[PDB]
Amino acid sequence: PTEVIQLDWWKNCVLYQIYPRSFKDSDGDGIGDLKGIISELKHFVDAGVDAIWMSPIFESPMVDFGYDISNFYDIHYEYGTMEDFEELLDKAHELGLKVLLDFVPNHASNESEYFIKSEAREPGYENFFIWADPLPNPENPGVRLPPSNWVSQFGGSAWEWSEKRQQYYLHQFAIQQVDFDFRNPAVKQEMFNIMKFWLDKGADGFRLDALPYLIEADPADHEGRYPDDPLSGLTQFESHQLGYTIPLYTKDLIELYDVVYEWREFLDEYNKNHGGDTRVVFSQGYANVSMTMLYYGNEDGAIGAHFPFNFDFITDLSSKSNARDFVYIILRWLTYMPYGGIPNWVFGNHDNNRMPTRFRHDMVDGLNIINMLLPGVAVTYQGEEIGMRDGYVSWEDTVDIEACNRGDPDTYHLYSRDPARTPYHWDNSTSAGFSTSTNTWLPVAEDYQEINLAKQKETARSHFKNYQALTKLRKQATLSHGEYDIRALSDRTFYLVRSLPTHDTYVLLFNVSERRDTVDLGRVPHLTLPATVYVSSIHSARLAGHEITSSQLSLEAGEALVLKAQPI
């Protein structure tokens, strides 16, 4: 068995997204907190997680549960103190974990000192945000028009009138989330200042949110006005409704990538000047594949985020997908990613329905196997390691500003992100062990007695035990250094093979369909029989250690196997 050089930590980490409000409540207020995370850092070691990122924990009025940041240099009081954060870093680092911070560079709370100073036209802050005059209305001079038809992601105009300043400010998100002017060198310098502060504290890097919205059209390019976004011309949207416009002037502007490349320059300089393990930036943006790959860098030699997140398992695959769709979407990242790009795989987050809800309850293990066996970085969202489902959230219990703004009692479910933010299922105790109180900030999902971590640790076969076996398998040279081959055997079943001369072969077989499928293992490259089941889905006929001798393999709907075969 050949010797392999270990990869840089960020090229093949298991990265786990914590939603701190919903992870662990240590003080009975029904709100997850830093002492809660600290008390369960051992969970990440137990799970085989290398790195955690937290949804925002900075001072925030909580309009968008942390994404409206009023102070980028201190901790939100409900989550705890700077001292709790420093204790979290110390204890995480002692356990060998990396810790990344999430913040949204696009915007600040209207309660931030930046915005208070800006609205007052304070020297240094007047132009910190996008401030615009009304569009001249010569035909009805007493009727004030917004600068353009731009629509907020949370509904209504992206322009809010300031009585104090007698101008509109831009908010691509909530009224309380004010868009920085990213053509302002002082805004760009402030972003370096924020990152330097948290790197100096010992953060191992950043997840940076909402990057497609950084830059909007310069009125200088449109005869001194903000240009209207083109109309979608879809009958089902009026001017206050997201979908009314195509964001040609408000999203994916080529200038945003220059800001990202400057962030990478800054981080490269920081790493050179501090040594120890590489500090990284992982970018978030929902965009088409071309716009997504520009986050890595460009073919003029620019270098950007260590990677942009791959949301293809959220946006392009679901329970509607067959095995050919799975393979074809997996191939999209691998086909479009630049030479030397690190692939990553995301199955969920706090903005989207949970993995088993988007797919099916019988597919959890197969989805975690894909995550863990594809080359590069596995990304796990809080709860995927135990197969948590969307929780039921009534209109009455809904707190997501997106649903409160865009929805009503009949439609709120089309918008609300709350079902994927329900408290983590630790055990079958009061509130699934998330809290000692029956009062939790979102309702605990009704299935917690059936789906909880403690039950999965006790029972012979579980989502969590499969998760542990897969994160353990990623330490094998075959998964860190091995080649990959992926093809559909049928509309129902695909294989993913990891192989490496002189090292064991590992094969995923996954029936993603609602029907049984019999496949010819003779078609699977590098699969020599007999082979051993390393991992099986929790209801597979095959237990771990089951010998596969026949070339004919019948798989149930949703059944997934990892086979261990002799080296190539």
Ligand X SMILES: *[C@@H]1O[C@H](CO)[C@@H](O)[C@H](O)[C@H]1O
Nearest residue (CB) to Mg ion, 33 versus 179: 33
- Any contact of residue 331 with its own copies (CB under 8 A)? yes
Q: Check if the beta carbon of residue 481 is closer than 8 Å to that of residue 4.
A: yes
Work out what residue 173 binds among Ca ion, ligand X, Mg ion, none; the CB cut-off runs from 5 to 8 Å by kind: ligand X
Burial class (CB in 10 A: 0-12, 13-18, 19+), 515: exposed
Nearest residue (CB) to Mg ion, 33 versus 362: 33
Closest C-alpha among 566, 161, 175 to residue 405:
175
Tell the smallest beta-carbon distance from residue 27 to Mg ion (Å).
4
CA distance 510 to 507: 10
387: left (phi over 0), alpha (psi -120 to 50) or beta: left
Work out what residue 424 binds among ligand X, its own copies, Ca ion, none; the CB cut-off runs from 5 to 8 Å by kind: none
- Any contact of residue 441 with ligand X (CB under 6 A)? no
CA distance 11 to 21: 28
End-to-end C-alpha distance for the chain, whole angstroms: 11
Number of residues in contact with Ca ion, rule: CB under 5 A?
A: 3
For residue 493, give the amino acid letter: T
Applying the rule CB under 6 A, the residues between 175 and 214 that interact with ligand X are 209-210
27 carries a ligand binding annotation: yes
Work out what residue 395 binds among Mg ion, its own copies, ligand X, none; the CB cut-off runs from 5 to 8 Å by kind: none
**Which positions ≥6 away from 120 have C-beta within 8 Å?**
164, 165
Tell the smallest beta-carbon distance from residue 379 to ligand X (Å).
13
DSSP state of 288: -
Task: Determine which residue in the list 339, 410, 522, 552 makes contact with its own copies, applying CB under 8 A.
Answer: 339
Nearest residue (CB) to ligand X, 210 versus 519: 210
Task: Determine which residue in the list 322, 353, 437, 532 makes contact with its own copies, applying CB under 8 A.
Answer: 322
300 carries a ligand binding annotation: no
Applying the rule CB under 8 A, the residues between 180 and 239 that interact with its own copies are 231, 233-236
Tell the smallest beta-carbon distance from residue 562 to its own copies (Å).
22
- Any contact of residue 351 with ligand X (CB under 6 A)? yes
Query: 193 in helix, strand or coil?
Result: helix
Task: Determine which residue in the list 104, 195, 323, 473 makes contact with ligand X, applying CB under 6 A.
Answer: 104
CA 289 to chain centre: 16
Applying the rule CB under 8 A, the residues between 504 and 563 that interact with its own copies are 515, 523
CA distance 358 to 315: 10
**Which positions ≥6 away from 193 have C-beta within 8 Å?**
none
Per DSSP bridges, beta strands 560-565 and 167-170 are unpaired
β-bridge mates for residue 169, sequence order: 131, 160
Nearest residue (CB) to ligand X, 98 versus 417: 417
DSSP state of 164: T
Task: Determine which residue in the list 13, 15, 18, 31 makes contact with Mg ion, applying CB under 5 A.
Answer: 31
Nearest residue (CB) to ligand X, 53 versus 495: 53
For residue 341, give the amino acid letter: G
- What tokens appear for 10 in the block? 């960020």
- Any contact of residue 59 with ligand X (CB under 6 A)? no
**Binding stretches for ligand X (CB under 6 A):** 64, 67, 104, 173, 209-210, 350-351
Q: Give the binding site for Ca ion (CB under 5 A).
A: 106, 179, 213
> Which residue positions form the known binding site for Mg(2+)?
25, 27, 29, 31, 33
